[PDB]
């Protein structure tokens, strides 16, 4: 599920395209998983060991990131394509 | 066993081997050569064929086994059919001399023409009681 | 028994009577196409249905490992001793424990019953 | 009654997103096979077997009035869950349903219609082999007919719906800013919690 | 396939 | 990859055949999708089992079932299917030999493991669908030895029958000497036991 | 009170020796089972050759099933009777059965001689697989 199905679910999802005017497009391409990480009150990442999750009533989860390519067309035959990495 | 046969419900389909709707437009003739013999035995005397009988034919075979087991004979089935349908159906039956218990049916000579016989077959096989 | 199709639309030919000649014609509806119907039989149903299973048996079942094999009955087309035996196990092949036999020899798909 | 079984027992088919079972040959004509021989070639492979033919006779007779693909598509569209008020919408809706909902594992492209036709033929062929008693009825609790959804497929099932919700949410946010004529920040569009 | 990221490539955006 | 291999072989796609050729051929299904037909099913199934047993293009968990009576070859690859390992039998002989047992005795410090057993084509995973097309020996010591013949064509052999039991039922000593409801009752009570 | 206190002098148990029969009894049970299997094979051979004739009111499957079922039932109860005859007077199974405290003669026969036919919905084990009860048999095998 993690290695293959998540990537395929994001990829086969329809691209978003919107209009009111400038056209906008969004496309999800690549997926990333860190290790299970805990952010303290200050917000510092640290590797969450599962025993800490058992003791502290946390959830032994890892964050999920995706590269999002936004392509905006301003009805002038141009396309500005900006790719936000690790969203 | 006689009383058992007398009360256990028997329908036409139980004692029939198969049927076939032929055409056979001339009722003097038959498409089946074995049929022509005893059909001629019933056709020296006209029996509701002086006027044009319907030029369809419904020919049924009755299982000798089930006919003997239920103590059924050739004639009383025809009597039951004629009672059920009056003279709307002209029914002839082969003389009881071989296991090929053949019964021919045509629509009355005063008479769909073809699929109405299919309706009559689907009726008589199940609902009609011997 | 025969099923016939039109020559212009290839739809099912329904039997019909020409009473003007008292003749059966397998006529196409919605195509005004007619043929000389010579089968002279419009319906049939084998209510008894003693139909042969050797027609229905496929010779490739000789290749089945799960089936029983015997030497009691040699083949009648090649004399091969080994044969695979089984039952119909089907409705309208009504309840009967009889055995149908298939010659295990390749290229001799002979079927029989004892 | 009297004439229902005179033709004989026939074959109907109930499809997704249709509020009424439809005759099978109507479905075949909707797929684009009007000739009866072409349909039976997809249904029956041995034409020298009269029994299968007699099984399929009344199904042909019921659908004999319809004799064109467009007529069959209008027939299907009239019986839809949301029927088209006009014939064009009915045919378009039936075409979409056959494109996407009827046997999607066979294919979703239009050019897979032939494959769908063959598969549908196989389906009715199996039914005939059950009706003629040539094949045994499949057993519901035969464990070979079962599959076990584990953490993998189950979490995939949830993740599909949650990703749908997330994409709908960012669509709403971005359209809020687009209808206002201004640009939107991508980070604020994503409601992370919808997954988490 | 899904790429793995090490903990050093996680920017501190989750605190901002 | 299964579709690519079958296209490389003489499997005729449905788009490129007249319906006249379907009657005398075997239908080929892949995950329930009718791909095409094939006219020599036996050697095709031999090839597919050869590829699977060698861990070639076909992976181990792919299951091929040939219905000979209905002329069908259903290949399944999706998840959710249950299977188990069975020892392969050829000409009333196990493909497992003493050399494999010797290599497995030194499972440590040799890097010979179960996966090499699967790769050697001695043991294969069989699913409950394919079990219908399998003639299985209970134990190799007697069930396939020459005698008054019961079945001379065994395709597989069980590793040990005791592996039919689950986890909680496998701690029962001598369960084959009990009444089965008490095997069930122990399978619950072992879950409830202190430890 | 009185009987429970006398039982401390008498005492009562149940053990492996109470479930053991002499070698002659085991040989008799095995001979009975061999005879039953042989005549079941005879019935199967009669059925396969169309020599078996259906009884009035039953189809041929029902006739065959009734014949084999009565065969195995008489074999089972004969083996159980023979095992019961082999019981000593000190045998604790017999002590608990004749007193009616627990168990039955069928339980002794199952423990000692033959567990018997296993039935599902009042019939023998059905063909879950393609004409088979398990993968370890050949197709169309109606043996015991
Ligand atoms: Zn025409
Ligand atoms: Zn031969």
């Amino acid at each position: 599920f993690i290695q293959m199905s998540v990537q395929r679910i994001v990829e086969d999802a329809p691209p978003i395209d919107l209009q009111a005017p400038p056209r906008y497009l969004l496309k999800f391409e690549q997926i990333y998983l860190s290790k299970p990480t805990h952010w303290e009150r200050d917000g510092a990442p640290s590797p969450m060991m599962p025993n800490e999750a058992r003791l502290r009533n946390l959830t032994y989860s890892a964050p999920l990131y995706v590269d999002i390519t936004k392509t905006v067309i301003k009805e002038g035959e141009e396309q500005l394509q900006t790719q936000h990495q690790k969203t | 066993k006689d009383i058992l046969c007398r009360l256990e419900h028997t329908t036409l389909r139980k004692v029939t081997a198969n049927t076939a709707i032929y055409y056979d437009p001339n009722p003097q003739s038959t498409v089946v050569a074995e049929d022509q013999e005893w059909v001629n035995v019933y056709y020296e005397m006209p029996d509701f064929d002086v006027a044009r009988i319907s030029p369809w034919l419904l020919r049924v075979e009755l299982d000798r086994k089930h006919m003997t087991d239920r103590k059924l004979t050739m004639e009383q089935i025809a009597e039951k059919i004629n009672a059920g349908f009056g003279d709307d159906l002209n029914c002839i039956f082969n003389d009881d001399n071989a296991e090929k218990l053949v019964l021919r049916i045509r629509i009355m000579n005063s008479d769909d023409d073809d699929v109405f016989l299919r309706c009559i077959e689907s009726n008589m096989l199940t609902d009609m009681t011997l | 028994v025969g099923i016939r199709f039109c020559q212009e639309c290839n739809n099912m030919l329904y039997p019909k009577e020409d009473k003007e000649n008292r003749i059966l014609l397998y006529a196409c509806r919605n195509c005004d196409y007619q043929q000389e119907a010579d089968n002279s039989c419009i319906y049939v149903n084998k209510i008894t249905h003693e139909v042969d299973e050797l027609t229905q048996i496929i010779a490739d079942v000789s290749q089945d490992p799960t089936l029983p094999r015997t030497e009691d009955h040699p083949c009648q087309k090649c004399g091969h001793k080994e044969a695979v035996f089984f039952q119909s196990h089907s409705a309208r092949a009504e309840d009967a424990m009889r055995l149908y036999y298939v010659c295990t020899a390749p290229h001799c798909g002979h079927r029989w019953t004892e | 009654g009297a004439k229902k079984s005179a033709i004989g027992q026939r074959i109907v088919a109930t499809l997704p997103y249709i509020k009424q079972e439809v005759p099978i040959i109507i479905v075949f004509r909707a797929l684009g096979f009007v000739s009866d021989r072409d349909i039976l070639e997809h249904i029956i492979y041995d034409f020298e077997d009269p029994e299968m033919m007699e099984m399929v006779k009344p199904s042909l007779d019921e659908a004999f009035v319809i004799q064109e693909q467009n007529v069959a598509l209008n027939f299907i569209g009239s019986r839809g869950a949301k029927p088209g008020v006009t014939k064009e919408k009915r045919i378009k809706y039936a075409k979409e349903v056959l494109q996407k909902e009827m046997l999607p594992h066979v294919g979703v492209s239009d050019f897979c219609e032939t494959k769908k036709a063959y598969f549908l033929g196989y389906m009715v062929h199996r039914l005939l082999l059950a009706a003629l008693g040539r094949r045994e009825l499949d057993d519901r609790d035969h464990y070979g007919n079962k599959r076990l959804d584990l953490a993998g497929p189950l979490l995939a099932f949830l993740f599909r719906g949650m990703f749908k919700n997330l994409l709908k949410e960012v669509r709403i946010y971005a359209q809020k800013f687009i209808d206002r004529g201004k640009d939107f920040n991508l980070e604020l569009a994503i409601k992370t919690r919808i997954i988490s | 396939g899904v790429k793995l990221l090490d903990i050093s490539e996680l920017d501190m955006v989750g605190a901002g | 990859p299964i579709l690519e291999f079958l296209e490389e072989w003489s499997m005729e796609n449905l788009e490129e055949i007249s319906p006249a050729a379907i009657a005398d051929a075997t239908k080929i299904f892949v995950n329930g999708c009718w791909v095409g037909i094939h006219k020599d099913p036996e050697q095709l199934m031999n090839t597919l089992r050869k590829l699977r047993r060698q861990m070639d293009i076909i992976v181990s968990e792919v299951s091929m079932i040939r219905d000979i009576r209905e002329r069908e070859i259903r290949i399944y690859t999706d998840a959710g299917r249950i299977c188990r390992p069975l020892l392969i039998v050829e000409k009333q002989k196990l493909l497992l030999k003493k050399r494999h047992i010797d290599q497995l005795k030194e499972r440590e410090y040799n890097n010979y493991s179960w996966q090499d057993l699967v790769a050697s084509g001695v043991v294969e995973y069989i699913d409950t669908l394919e079990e219908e097309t399998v003639m299985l020996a209970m134990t190799p010591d007697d069930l396939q030895e020459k005698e008054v013949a019961y079945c001379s064509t065994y395709t597989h052999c069980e590793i040990h029958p005791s592996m039919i039991l689950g986890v909680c039922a496998s701690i029962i000593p001598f369960p084959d000497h009990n009444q089965s409801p008490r095997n069930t009752y122990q399978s619950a009570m072992g879950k409830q036991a202190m430890g | 009170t009185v009987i429970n206190n006398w039982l401390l002098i008498e005492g009562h148990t149940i053990g492996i020796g109470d479930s053991i029969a002499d070698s002659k009894t085991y040989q008799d049970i095995q001979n009975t089972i061999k005879k039953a299997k042989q005549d079941v094979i005879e019935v199967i051979e009669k059925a396969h050759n169309n020599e078996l004739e259906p009884t009035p009111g039953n189809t041929l499957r029902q006739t065959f099933e009734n014949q084999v079922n009565r065969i195995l039932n008489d074999a089972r109860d004969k083996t159980g009777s023979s095992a019961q005859k082999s019981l000593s007077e000190y045998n604790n199974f017999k002590s608990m059965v004749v007193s009616g405290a627990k168990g039955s003669k069928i339980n002794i026969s199952q423990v000692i001689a033959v567990v018997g036919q296993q039935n599902v919905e009042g019939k023998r084990i059905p063909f879950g697989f393609k004409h088979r009860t398990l993968p370890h048999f050949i197709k169309d095998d109606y043996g015991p």
Side-chain angles (χ1 to χ4, degrees):
Chain A
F1 157 84
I2 294 292
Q3 292 187 19
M4 269 64 76
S5 81
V6 171
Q7 181 64 246
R8 292 174 293 181
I9 287 163
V10 298
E11 283 180 343
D12 73 339
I16 297 169
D17 47 357
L18 295 177
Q19 177 70 331
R23 303 291 294 275
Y24 295 83
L25 320 172
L26 295 173
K27 188 72 195 67
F28 315 92
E29 47 180 349
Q30 183 62 31
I31 292 293
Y32 305 85
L33 267 90
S34 156
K35 300 298 197 181
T37 310
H38 174 53
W39 290 281
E40 298 175 342
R41 304 176 80 172
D42 67 332
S46 175
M48 190 202 299
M49 318 321 297
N51 200 9
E52 303 189 59
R54 289 204 205 82
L55 288 172
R56 289 183 59 186
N57 291 35
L58 313 177
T59 296
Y60 190 70
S61 60
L64 181 58
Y65 303 88
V66 64
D67 286 8
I68 304 180
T69 311
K70 171 162 67 171
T71 289
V72 58
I73 323 186
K74 291 181 294 306
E75 63 269 9
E77 301 83 33
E78 65 267 352
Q79 306 187 130
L80 170 55
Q81 177 164 207
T82 178
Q83 45 176 6
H84 311 76
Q85 306 301 110
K86 306 181 175 85
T87 309
Chain B
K1 192 165 69 175
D2 303 342
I3 307 308
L4 177 148
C5 292
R6 281 200 325 171
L7 60 96
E8 201 283 335
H9 180 245
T10 81
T11 190
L12 181 61
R13 185 219 58 184
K14 281 289 193 71
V15 296
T16 53
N18 56 358
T19 178
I21 290 173
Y22 293 98
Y23 178 52
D24 187 14
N26 174 32
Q28 270 61 20
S29 72
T30 64
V31 179
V32 179
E34 295 84 348
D35 193 23
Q36 185 63 12
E37 303 291 334
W38 66 263
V39 164
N40 293 341
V41 173
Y42 285 95
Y43 268 68
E44 69 276 348
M45 184 64 213
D47 301 329
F48 304 129
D49 54 356
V50 297
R52 279 287 297 172
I53 203 76
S54 171
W56 300 105
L57 166 59
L58 173 53
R59 189 211 193 235
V60 310
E61 307 298 303
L62 317 178
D63 186 10
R64 170 62 79 193
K65 174 59 69 175
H66 302 158
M67 284 289 288
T68 51
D69 296 358
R70 279 157 182 75
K71 313 303 298 303
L72 281 159
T73 182
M74 204 75 202
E75 57 83 30
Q76 67 194 149
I77 293 163
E79 303 318 318
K80 191 65 63 59
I81 298 159
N82 284 279
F85 297 89
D87 200 359
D88 180 73
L89 317 180
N90 177 24
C91 306
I92 321 298
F93 47 88
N94 82 315
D95 301 333
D96 186 13
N97 52 8
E99 80 194 41
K100 306 188 181 186
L101 300 177
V102 186
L103 205 155
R104 298 173 76 255
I105 313 179
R106 300 181 158 268
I107 303 170
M108 73 206 305
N109 61 341
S110 185
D111 167 68
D112 208 333
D113 194 8
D114 193 17
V115 299
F116 186 56
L117 291 182
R118 291 195 68 180
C119 158
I120 287 159
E121 182 212 316
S122 52
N123 165 274
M124 292 170 73
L125 279 177
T126 63
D127 57 66
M128 196 185 71
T129 296
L130 309 177
Chain C
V1 287
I3 317 306
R4 311 196 192 179
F5 290 82
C6 177
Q7 269 53 43
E8 329 305 324
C9 54
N10 301 18
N11 295 10
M12 189 165 65
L13 290 191
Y14 303 91
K16 191 190 292 300
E17 171 176 348
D18 175 286
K19 64 189 289 185
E20 281 68 17
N21 291 281
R22 300 298 192 187
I23 187 68
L24 192 64
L25 302 170
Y26 271 127
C28 190
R29 291 199 221 103
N30 90 262
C31 204
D32 67 279
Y33 170 65
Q34 309 186 358
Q35 299 191 156
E36 168 50 32
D38 60 314
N39 183 245
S40 56
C41 180
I42 295 82
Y43 181 81
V44 65
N45 54 338
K46 288 189 60 42
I47 293 163
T48 177
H49 53 60
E50 76 290 336
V51 301
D52 184 18
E53 312 308 310
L54 315 179
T55 56
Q56 308 303 110
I57 287 163
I58 290 170
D60 305 336
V61 303
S62 65
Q63 300 163 349
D64 190 3
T66 56
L67 276 170
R69 288 153 167 73
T70 178
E71 314 306 331
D72 175 49
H73 308 262
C75 178
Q76 302 88 76
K77 279 191 171 183
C78 59
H80 194 257
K81 295 179 178 179
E82 197 180 44
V84 169
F85 67 93
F86 57 92
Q87 320 191 0
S88 54
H89 209 121
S90 297
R92 299 200 307 167
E94 293 294 338
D95 279 13
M97 294 285 193
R98 66 187 301 162
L99 296 178
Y100 311 95
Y101 294 75
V102 172
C103 171
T104 314
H107 316 297
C108 182
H110 183 27
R111 287 100 71 192
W112 68 90
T113 182
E114 296 287 304
Chain D
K3 306 170 212 185
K4 159 58 197 76
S5 288
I7 63 177
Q9 57 177 342
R10 64 189 175 270
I11 303 155
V12 79
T14 172
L15 312 172
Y17 300 164
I18 310 292
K19 60 170 65 165
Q20 190 183 155
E21 60 270 20
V22 55
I24 179 56
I25 317 301
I26 300 296
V27 182
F28 272 86
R29 292 208 166 83
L31 279 175
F33 298 90
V34 59
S35 165
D36 305 336
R37 194 186 310 176
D38 297 2
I39 298 167
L40 270 71
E41 278 169 296
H42 289 187
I43 296 172
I44 314 177
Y45 320 120
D46 179 17
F47 275 76
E48 299 87 53
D49 190 0
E51 300 168 61
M52 305 277 280
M53 302 289 160
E54 284 118 46
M55 291 306 298
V56 299
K57 289 298 182 64
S59 298
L60 295 170
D61 297 338
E62 189 189 33
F64 176 63
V65 289
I66 293 103
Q67 212 68 232
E68 180 57 26
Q69 167 169 354
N70 306 320
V71 179
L73 285 160
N74 172 81
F75 190 97
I76 291 167
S78 64
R79 305 189 169 191
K82 173 54 174 61
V85 296
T86 187
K87 177 247 286 180
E88 200 282 334
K89 286 290 293 188
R90 280 171 270 178
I91 289 166
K92 189 195 292 180
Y93 176 66
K95 199 168 186 169
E96 194 70 13
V97 166
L98 269 58
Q99 174 71 0
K100 287 188 170 170
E101 302 296 326
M102 192 189 72
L103 303 172
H105 86 279
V106 176
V108 202
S109 178
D110 63 332
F111 314 118
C112 301
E113 59 185 308
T114 304
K115 297 195 279 290
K116 288 204 184 184
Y118 272 110
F119 192 88
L120 186 57
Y122 168 73
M123 286 193 72
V124 298
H125 173 77
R126 285 287 302 284
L127 193 64
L128 300 192
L129 300 192
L132 301 179
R134 308 190 186 185
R135 281 190 65 164
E136 292 77 9
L137 309 183
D138 294 325
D139 186 9
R140 292 170 192 89
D141 58 359
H142 181 283
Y143 202 72
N145 304 326
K146 306 291 182 67
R147 300 288 179 277
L148 304 180
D149 302 335
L150 274 65
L154 291 171
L155 289 177
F157 149 76
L158 274 180
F159 195 76
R160 282 187 192 84
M162 290 170 207
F163 205 68
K164 270 179 68 58
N165 294 6
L166 174 57
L167 270 67
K168 196 173 59 49
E169 179 58 34
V170 304
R171 268 183 291 177
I172 287 165
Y173 183 90
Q175 191 64 35
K176 242 69 182 160
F177 278 64
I178 287 158
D179 277 342
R180 250 199 288 271
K182 52 176 67 167
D183 189 8
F184 67 100
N185 181 240
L186 182 59
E187 302 295 336
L188 313 183
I190 290 161
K191 284 193 170 56
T192 71
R193 303 300 197 278
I194 298 175
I195 288 170
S196 292
Chain E
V2 178
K3 286 165 174 173
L4 189 79
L5 297 176
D6 207 331
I7 202 167
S8 52
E9 285 191 62
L10 302 177
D11 295 300
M12 301 204 294
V13 169
Chain F
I2 312 305
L3 308 177
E4 295 155 35
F5 168 73
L6 295 180
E7 291 166 331
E8 283 175 326
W9 273 55
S10 65
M11 184 216 62
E12 311 191 20
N13 173 31
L14 280 179
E15 305 300 314
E16 61 180 356
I17 63 188
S18 178
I22 309 178
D24 62 348
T26 65
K27 312 182 184 64
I28 311 302
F29 298 81
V30 178
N31 296 318
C33 179
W34 189 2
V35 180
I37 59 168
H38 203 269
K39 302 199 176 184
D40 193 350
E42 188 182 5
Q43 66 97 38
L44 174 57
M45 282 296 298
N46 295 346
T47 309
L48 294 177
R49 288 175 297 194
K50 184 179 72 173
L51 292 184
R52 186 176 63 173
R53 291 165 184 191
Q54 289 178 319
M55 296 189 76
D56 301 354
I57 296 154
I58 312 177
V59 301
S60 63
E61 63 188 316
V62 166
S63 63
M64 305 78 76
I65 310 99
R66 189 194 164 182
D67 194 321
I68 303 110
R69 185 174 173 281
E70 310 307 330
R71 296 183 165 184
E72 301 184 8
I73 295 169
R74 294 198 278 280
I75 303 178
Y76 289 104
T77 314
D78 60 345
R81 297 171 299 100
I82 185 150
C83 54
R84 45 164 195 160
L86 298 175
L87 303 171
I88 304 175
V89 174
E90 289 292 337
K91 280 80 75 173
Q92 302 292 103
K93 297 183 182 180
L94 282 174
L95 301 188
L96 193 71
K97 307 297 180 182
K98 294 166 56 49
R99 50 173 169 176
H100 303 90
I101 305 304
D102 301 338
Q103 293 166 262
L104 288 173
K105 277 183 183 184
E106 297 181 347
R107 187 160 43 261
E108 300 177 355
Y109 57 81
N110 192 20
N111 302 316
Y112 195 83
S113 69
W114 168 265
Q115 282 289 323
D116 300 344
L117 249 186
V118 186
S120 70
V122 172
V123 64
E124 63 180 353
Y125 290 83
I126 296 298
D127 63 330
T128 170
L129 269 162
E130 192 172 2
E131 283 191 336
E132 293 186 336
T133 66
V134 161
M135 186 64 213
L136 177 53
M138 188 61 68
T139 74
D141 295 0
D142 47 346
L143 278 290
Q144 67 192 3
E145 301 298 314
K146 279 306 301 147
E147 60 195 39
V148 56
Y150 173 64
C151 180
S152 74
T153 71
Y154 281 106
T155 53
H156 295 80
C157 181
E158 293 254 350
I159 315 198
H160 198 270
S162 59
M163 313 311 289
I164 64 188
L165 304 181
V167 171
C168 279
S170 64
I171 71 184
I172 304 187
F174 307 109
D176 60 319
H177 300 253
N178 294 338
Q179 215 189 4
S180 28
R182 293 297 175 290
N183 292 344
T184 296
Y185 290 2
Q186 170 47 38
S187 69
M189 291 162 199
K191 254 163 295 189
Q192 290 168 42
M194 277 193 175
Chain G
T1 52
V2 171
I3 301 302
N4 288 333
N5 283 281
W6 175 77
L7 192 58
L8 300 180
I9 293 169
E10 178 58 22
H12 169 56
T13 179
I14 188 71
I16 289 292
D18 304 315
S19 61
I20 289 281
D22 56 68
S23 62
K24 175 174 175 293
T25 307
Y26 294 146
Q27 185 60 77
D28 164 76
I29 291 158
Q30 287 178 310
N31 295 342
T32 306
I33 292 289
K34 258 199 282 186
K35 174 158 65 185
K37 288 193 174 191
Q38 287 165 304
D39 55 57
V40 166
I41 290 166
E42 288 182 350
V43 169
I44 281 166
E45 285 166 326
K46 287 198 188 74
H48 285 171
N49 303 3
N50 303 266
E51 297 172 322
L52 179 61
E53 295 290 328
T55 67
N58 293 319
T59 189
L60 208 67
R61 309 294 174 174
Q62 279 180 304
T63 292
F64 173 86
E65 284 290 342
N66 292 15
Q67 284 198 347
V68 302
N69 284 7
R70 69 169 308 291
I71 280 166
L72 299 180
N73 291 336
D74 60 58
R76 179 198 62 197
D77 54 52
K78 185 172 179 182
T79 46
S81 77
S82 69
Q84 287 159 222
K85 297 304 292 290
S86 177
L87 298 177
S88 165
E89 69 277 40
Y90 309 99
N91 175 275
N92 295 96
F93 268 109
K94 190 169 189 177
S95 80
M96 279 183 280
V97 161
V98 299
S99 63
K102 190 58 62 187
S104 173
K105 308 240 184 187
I106 181 58
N107 301 120
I108 296 178
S109 67
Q110 289 193 312
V111 165
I112 295 181
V114 161
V115 169
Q117 179 61 60
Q118 304 303 287
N119 280 281
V120 171
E121 52 83 41
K123 313 196 195 120
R124 293 203 296 173
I125 297 295
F127 301 117
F129 293 83
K130 295 290 290 186
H131 317 333
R132 303 191 296 179
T133 55
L134 279 177
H136 314 268
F137 305 110
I138 64 192
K139 290 202 181 188
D140 302 326
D141 184 10
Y142 295 88

